[PDB]
Tab-separated table of C-alpha atoms in Angstrom:
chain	number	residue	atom	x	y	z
A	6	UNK	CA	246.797	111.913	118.951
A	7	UNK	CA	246.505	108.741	120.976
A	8	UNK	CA	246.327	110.948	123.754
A	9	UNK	CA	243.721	113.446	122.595
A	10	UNK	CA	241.688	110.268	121.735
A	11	UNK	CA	241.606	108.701	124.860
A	12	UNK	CA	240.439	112.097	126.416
A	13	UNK	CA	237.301	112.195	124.056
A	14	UNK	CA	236.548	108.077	124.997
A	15	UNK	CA	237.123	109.054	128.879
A	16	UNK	CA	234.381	111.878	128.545
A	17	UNK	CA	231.697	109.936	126.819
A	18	UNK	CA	232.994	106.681	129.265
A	19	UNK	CA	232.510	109.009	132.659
A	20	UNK	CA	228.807	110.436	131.647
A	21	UNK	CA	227.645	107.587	130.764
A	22	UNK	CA	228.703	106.338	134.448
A	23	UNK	CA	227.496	109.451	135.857
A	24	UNK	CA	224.007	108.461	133.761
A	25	UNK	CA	224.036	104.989	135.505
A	26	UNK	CA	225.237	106.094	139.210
A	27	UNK	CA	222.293	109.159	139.132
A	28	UNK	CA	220.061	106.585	138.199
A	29	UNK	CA	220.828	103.809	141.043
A	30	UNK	CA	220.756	107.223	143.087
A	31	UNK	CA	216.574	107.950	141.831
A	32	UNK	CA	216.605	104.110	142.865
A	33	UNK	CA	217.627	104.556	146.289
A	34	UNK	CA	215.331	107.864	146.955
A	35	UNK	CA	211.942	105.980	145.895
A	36	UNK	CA	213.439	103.263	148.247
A	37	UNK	CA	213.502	105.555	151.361
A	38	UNK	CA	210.593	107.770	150.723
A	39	UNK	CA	208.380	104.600	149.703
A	40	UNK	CA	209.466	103.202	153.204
A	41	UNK	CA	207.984	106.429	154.969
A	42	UNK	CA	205.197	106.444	153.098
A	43	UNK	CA	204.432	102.728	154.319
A	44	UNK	CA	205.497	103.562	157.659
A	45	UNK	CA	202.603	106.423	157.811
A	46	UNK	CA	200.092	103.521	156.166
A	47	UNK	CA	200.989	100.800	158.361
A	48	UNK	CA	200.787	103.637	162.015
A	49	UNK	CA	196.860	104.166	160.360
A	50	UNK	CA	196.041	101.041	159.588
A	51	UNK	CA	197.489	99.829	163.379
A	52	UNK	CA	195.585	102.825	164.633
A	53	UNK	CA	192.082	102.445	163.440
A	54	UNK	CA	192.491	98.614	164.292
A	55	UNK	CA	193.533	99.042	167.313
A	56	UNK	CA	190.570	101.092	167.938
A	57	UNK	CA	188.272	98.333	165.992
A	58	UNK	CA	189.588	95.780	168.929
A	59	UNK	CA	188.382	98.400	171.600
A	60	UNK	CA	185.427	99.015	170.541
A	61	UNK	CA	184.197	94.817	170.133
A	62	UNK	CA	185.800	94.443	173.644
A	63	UNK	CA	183.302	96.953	174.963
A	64	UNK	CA	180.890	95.573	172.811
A	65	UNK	CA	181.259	92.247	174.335
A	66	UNK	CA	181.452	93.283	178.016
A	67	UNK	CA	178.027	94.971	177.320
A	68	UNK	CA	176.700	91.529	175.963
A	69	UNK	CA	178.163	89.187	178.841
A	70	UNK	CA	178.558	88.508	182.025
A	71	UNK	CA	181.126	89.506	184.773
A	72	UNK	CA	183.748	87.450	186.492
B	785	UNK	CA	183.453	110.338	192.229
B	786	UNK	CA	182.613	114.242	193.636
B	787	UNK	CA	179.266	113.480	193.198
B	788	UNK	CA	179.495	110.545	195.301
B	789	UNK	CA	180.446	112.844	197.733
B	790	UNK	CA	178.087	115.676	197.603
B	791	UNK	CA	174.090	115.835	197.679
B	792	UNK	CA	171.569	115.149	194.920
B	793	UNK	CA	171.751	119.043	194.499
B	794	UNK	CA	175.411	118.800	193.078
B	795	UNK	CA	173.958	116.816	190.013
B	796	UNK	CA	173.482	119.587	188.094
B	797	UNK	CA	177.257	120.316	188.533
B	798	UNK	CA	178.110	116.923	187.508
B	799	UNK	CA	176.028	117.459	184.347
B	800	UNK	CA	178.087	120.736	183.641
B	801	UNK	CA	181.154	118.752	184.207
B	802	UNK	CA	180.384	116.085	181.932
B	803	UNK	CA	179.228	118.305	179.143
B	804	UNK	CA	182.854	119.911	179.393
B	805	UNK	CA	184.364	116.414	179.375
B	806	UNK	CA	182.471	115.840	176.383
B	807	UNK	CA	184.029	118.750	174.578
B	808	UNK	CA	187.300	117.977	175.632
B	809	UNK	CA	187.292	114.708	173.615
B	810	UNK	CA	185.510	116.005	170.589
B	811	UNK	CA	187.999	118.962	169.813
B	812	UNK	CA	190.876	115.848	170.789
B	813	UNK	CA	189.406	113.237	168.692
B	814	UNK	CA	190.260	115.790	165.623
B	815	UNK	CA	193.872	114.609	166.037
B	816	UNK	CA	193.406	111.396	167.794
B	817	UNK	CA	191.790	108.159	167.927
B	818	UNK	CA	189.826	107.875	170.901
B	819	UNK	CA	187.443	105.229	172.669
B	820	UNK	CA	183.836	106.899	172.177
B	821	UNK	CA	182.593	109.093	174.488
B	822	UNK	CA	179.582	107.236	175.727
B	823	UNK	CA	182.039	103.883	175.803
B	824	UNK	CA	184.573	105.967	177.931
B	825	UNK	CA	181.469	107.434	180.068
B	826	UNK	CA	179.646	103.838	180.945
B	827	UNK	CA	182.947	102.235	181.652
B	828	UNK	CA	183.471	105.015	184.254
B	829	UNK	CA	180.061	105.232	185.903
B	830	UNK	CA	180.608	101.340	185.830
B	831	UNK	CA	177.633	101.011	183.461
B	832	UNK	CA	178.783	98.634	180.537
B	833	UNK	CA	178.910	94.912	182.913
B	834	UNK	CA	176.123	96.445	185.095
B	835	UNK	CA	172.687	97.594	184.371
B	836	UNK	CA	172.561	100.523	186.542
B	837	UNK	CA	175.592	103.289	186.716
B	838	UNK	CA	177.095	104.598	190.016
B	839	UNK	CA	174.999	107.975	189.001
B	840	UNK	CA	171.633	106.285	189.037
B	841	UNK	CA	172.814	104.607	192.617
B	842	UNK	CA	174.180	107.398	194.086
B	843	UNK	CA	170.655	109.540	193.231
B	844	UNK	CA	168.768	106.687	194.837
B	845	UNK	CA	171.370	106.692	197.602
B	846	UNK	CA	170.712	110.100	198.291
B	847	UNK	CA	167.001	110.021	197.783
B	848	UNK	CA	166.843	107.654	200.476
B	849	UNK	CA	169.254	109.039	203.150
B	850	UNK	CA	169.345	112.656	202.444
B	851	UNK	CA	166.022	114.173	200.046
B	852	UNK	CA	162.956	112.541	201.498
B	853	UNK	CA	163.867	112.685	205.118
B	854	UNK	CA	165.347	116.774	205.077
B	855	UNK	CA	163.569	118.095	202.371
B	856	UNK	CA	160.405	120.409	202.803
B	857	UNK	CA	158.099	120.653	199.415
B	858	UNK	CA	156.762	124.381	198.491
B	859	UNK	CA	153.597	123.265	196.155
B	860	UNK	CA	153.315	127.184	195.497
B	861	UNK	CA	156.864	127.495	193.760
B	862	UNK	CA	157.488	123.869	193.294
């Protein structure tokens, strides 16, 4: 009887773990994939500016004078 | 720089060239970010700090040592 009751407790006690560990597992996914999605942002954004100094470089050498 | 090295009769040649060079970079600037064409072109005929390219030079270059003193005009077939 105590036995059998403390069998029913441990099975609503362990899902209700398993509830909170899958959750700080959903946690950890958005973590990664929201750090590869940045990563892919931050490679355009340093690509396109890159290409911004370039260009105003050239522009500048067009408008100048040589050494 | 091979049409530094040939006569003013291997311009057209150079033209082909560049107009292949200029598809090259259009079907690669689908995937990449390049320098524009005519910014890559000038800085390689030396035509961005300079008002007149290594082309233009080398045609007058050639006009002067080569075309008018070996060169025999046919007014009938131009």
């Amino acid at each position: 009887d105590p036995v059998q009751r403390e069998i029913h407790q441990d099975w609503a006690n362990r899902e209700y773990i398993e509830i909170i560990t899958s959750s700080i597992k959903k946690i950890a996914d958005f973590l990664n994939s929201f750090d590869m999605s940045c990563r892919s942002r931050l490679a355009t954004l340093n690509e396109k500016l890159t290409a911004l100094e370039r260009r105003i470089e050239y522009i500048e050498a067009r408008v100048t004078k040589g050494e | 720089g091979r049409f530094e090295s040939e006569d003013l009769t291997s311009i057209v040649e150079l033209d082909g060239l560049l107009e292949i060079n200029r598809m090259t970079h259009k079907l690669l600037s689908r995937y990449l970010t390049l320098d524009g064409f005519d910014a890559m072109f000038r800085e390689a005929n030396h035509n961005v700090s300079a008002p007149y390219g290594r082309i233009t030079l080398h045609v007058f270059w050639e006009l002067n040592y080569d075309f008018l003193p070996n060169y025999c005009y046919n007014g009938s077939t131009n």
